[PDB]
């Protein structure tokens, strides 16, 4: 395998929260129901959602951000240990196949009012 | 292939703009003429230039930042879809050859007053 | 080889410094004696220490952050040219072996009140 793409994204947390508040429908456009919940069932907070938004932007960048990708066709899920993972379906999986992507790597971080993500596509 | 190096850089946009304003010659020292223009021919803005500066710093870091690298020997170019790409020549290409680098991967992001870049060298 | 994990971390410098000041023992819990010194023997500054903290957090993330990792089992050392490098021992090396990690790549950056690091584990 080789690296197919890398993506990075930085998202200002306060601004992201404001966008979610302004348009009730936005959260459901960006996130699957599972992503909006913490492991124990409570509602995921704004900084953690901003990090997932950054991850999806970074994933899109790693794929060359073509038209027609759906936010809901990329899913951030969480291993028991807390580690974030990417699962791709539909439009995102189709684009990944065009480029020969077999494996996805992600990491997330938030501090100082920002959320960040890096994504590497490999295949 | 294997990873040869990784680089990351974060640049404060306002400070970068101030540096460009202070010394008229600076932009031409850091950037090729093509980098200073948007696809349609207008002048590239300060945040986008800061992201390209970060990319060049990150590229230097991925190569172990030896003396003698020229800023103008690394070029950020743009695919039709908008995706940034690195082209290396001269001093930067020579150092890349010393290390066996065959392929370059870059991503850029700006928000919250900062521009950022990640670069991976592979070979 | 393939990518085994990636980590990113962003650390607010001022807050990190405040934590070090609040608990005298903290620096020695996070850092080996060598990490606390500059090449010439003077004391390493807070932003540079924050970048090393971010590197260790990013390394932990690349390994899936299991319980039992010691901060002192990851060491940031510096090549003559200034390039940062990771050396792993003990608990961190043991976890790396569980995952098959052969090679480590790191880069550090600080600006705009933040320190950042990216780490890639390969094997
Ligand atoms: C292009 C895009 C990915 C980045 O936009 P953004 O997060 O608002 O802005 P950022 O500052 O973080 O990133 C902008 C940088 O992305 C890079 N970029 C632009 N188009 C790109 C593309 N087609 N592929 C990869 N990178 C691209 C550029 O370097 C740009 O900076 P520049 O114009 O100064 O060179 C975004 O506008 C977009 O089209 N998002 C699509 C997301 C998506 O499809 N999601 C559904 C599936 S998860
Ligand atoms: C070393 C350099 C790359 C980073 O400087 P910077 O962007 O101003 O500062 P940042 O905070 O972003 O990065 C500093 C970190 O880079 C790392 N670094 C220093 N020397 C390095 C080197 N030789 N190789 C890789 N990384 C290096 C260090 O970890 C340092 O932090 P630390 O001293 O606390 O450990 C920069 O000073 C430099 O020499 N730039 C050269 C650019 C160049 O050659 N361009 C032309 C070709 S594109
Ligand atoms: C999990 C941890 C790595 C990140 O915490 P942090 O730096 O305070 O917080 P950040 O915002 O930077 O990162 C949090 C993100 O890390 C990710 N994360 C959580 N658990 C993780 C794990 N087991 N593996 C990889 N990533 C993990 C998550 O995506 C989380 O964000 P989310 O909850 O919104 O999804 C940290 O809490 C930790 O346990 N550190 C261990 C360090 C260590 O073991 N050091 C000694 C050896 S060097
Ligand atoms: Mg963005
Ligand atoms: Mg820098
Ligand atoms: Mg952190």
Resolution limit in angstroms? 1.4
The helix (run of H) or strand (run of E) holding residue B29 is helix B26-30
Tokens at B99, concatenated: 């290390």
Q: State the Cα–Cα distance between residues B101 and C4, nearest whole angstrom.
A: 20
Among residues B88, A8, A25, the alpha carbon closest in space to that of C6 is found at A8
* Placement of tokens 């349609």 in the chain: B40
Q: Based on DSSP, count helices (H) and strands (E) in chain A, helices before strands.
A: 4, 5
CB contact under 8 A, B103 and A58: no
Q: For the stretch B65-104, what's the b/e string if a residue is b when 16 or more beta carbons lie within 10 angstroms of its beta carbon? A: beeebebbbbbbeeeeeebbebebeebbeebbeeeebeeb
Nearest to A107 among C2, C7, C11 (CB): C7
Q: State the Cα–Cα distance between residues B95 and B101, nearest whole angstrom.
A: 9
Q: State the Cα–Cα distance between residues C32 and B90, nearest whole angstrom.
A: 40
Torsion from C-alpha of C33, C51, C76, B106, nearest 10 degrees: -170
Q: State the Cα–Cα distance between residues C80 and C59, nearest whole angstrom.
A: 23
Per-residue CA distances from B118 to A68, B82, B122 (Å): 25, 17, 13
Contact A53, A61 (CB under 8 A): no
Beta bridge partners of B111: B114
Around Cβ C42, how many Cβ atoms within 10 Å? 8
Residues near C109 by Cβ (< 8 Å), separated by ≥ 6? Answer: B8, B9, B10, B57, B58, B61, C51, C115, C116, C117
Annotated binding site of A for Mg(2+): 9, 57
Per-residue CA distances from B107 to B52, B55, B86, C41, C90 (Å): 10, 8, 10, 36, 34
Tokens at A64, concatenated: 């060359």
CB contact under 8 A, C109 and B10: yes
Contact B112, B80 (CB under 8 A): no
Q: Dihedral of CA B112/B72/A4/B80: which sign?
A: positive
Q: State the Cα–Cα distance between residues B5 and B86, nearest whole angstrom.
A: 15
Tokens at C87, concatenated: 């050396």
Among residues C121, B48, C116, the alpha carbon closest in space to that of A112 is found at C116
Q: What does chain C look like in DSSP terms, one character per residue?
A: --EEEEEEEEEEHHHHHHHHHH-TTHHHHH--GGGGB-TTSSBPPHHHHHHHHHHHHHHHHHTT--TT--GGGEEEEE-TTS-EEEEE-HHHHHHHHHHT--EEEEEEEEETTEEEEEEEEE-
* Placement of tokens 């950054």 in the chain: A54
Rounded to the nearest 10 degrees, the angle between the axes of helix C13-22 and helix C46-62 is 100
Tell whether A98 lies on the interface with B, counting CB pairs under 8 A: no
Distance between A25 CA and the closest CA of chain C, angstroms: 30
Tokens at C59, concatenated: 């390394």
Q: How far apart are the first and last CA of chain A?
A: 5
Q: Is the beta carbon of B82 within 6 A of some atom in ligand 1? A: yes
Among residues C74, C45, C77, the alpha carbon closest in space to that of C61 is found at C74
The helix (run of H) or strand (run of E) holding residue B118 is strand B114-122
Q: Distance, CA B110 to ligand 4 centroid (Å)? A: 6
User: Based on the structure, what is the number of domains in chain A?
Assistant: 1
- How far is C-alpha B90 from the chain's CA centre? 15
Q: State the Cα–Cα distance between residues A91 and B75, nearest whole angstrom.
A: 32
Q: What does A32-62 look like in DSSP terms, one character per residue?
A: -GGGGB-TTSSBPPHHHHHHHHHHHHHHHHH
C57 in a labelled binding site: yes
Tell whether C26 lies on the interface with A, counting CB pairs under 8 A: no
Q: Dihedral of CA B45/B46/B52/B56: which sign?
A: positive
Among residues C101, C85, C91, C46, the alpha carbon closest in space to that of C71 is found at C91
Full residue range of the structural domain in which residue A75 is found: 1-123
Contact C21, C14 (CB under 8 A): no
Q: State the Cα–Cα distance between residues C82 and C66, nearest whole angstrom.
A: 31
CB contact under 8 A, B7 and C112: no
Instruction: Tell me the CATH number at C86.
Output: 3.90.470.20
Tell whether C40 lies on the interface with B, counting CB pairs under 8 A: no
Q: ∠ CA(B31), CA(B34), CA(B15), 5° rounding? A: 35
Per-residue CA distances from B33 to B64, B70, B71 (Å): 26, 15, 12
Contact C95, C104 (CB under 8 A): no
Ligand nearest to the CA of residue B39, numbered in listed order: 1
Among residues C113, C62, C115, C114, the alpha carbon closest in space to that of C86 is found at C62
Q: State the Cα–Cα distance between residues C108 and C86, nearest whole angstrom.
A: 12
Residues near C68 by Cβ (< 8 Å), separated by ≥ 6? Answer: C91
């Amino acid at each position: 395998m080789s690296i197919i793409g890398v993506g990075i994204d930085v998202a200002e947390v306060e601004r992201f929260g404001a966008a979610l508040e302004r348009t009730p429908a936005l959260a459901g456009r960006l996130f699957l129901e599972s992503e909006l919940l913490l492991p124990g069932g409570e509602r995921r907070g704004v900084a953690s959602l901003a990090a997932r938004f950054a991850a999806k932007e970074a994933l899109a960048k790693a794929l060359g951000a073509p038209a027609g990708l759906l936010w809901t066709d990329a899913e951030v899920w969480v291993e028991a240990g807390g580690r974030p993972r990417l699962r791709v379906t539909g439009t995102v999986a189709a684009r990944a196949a065009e480029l020969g992507v077999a494996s996805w790597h992600v990491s997330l971080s938030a501090d100082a009012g920002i959320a960040s993500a890096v994504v590497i596509a490999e295949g």
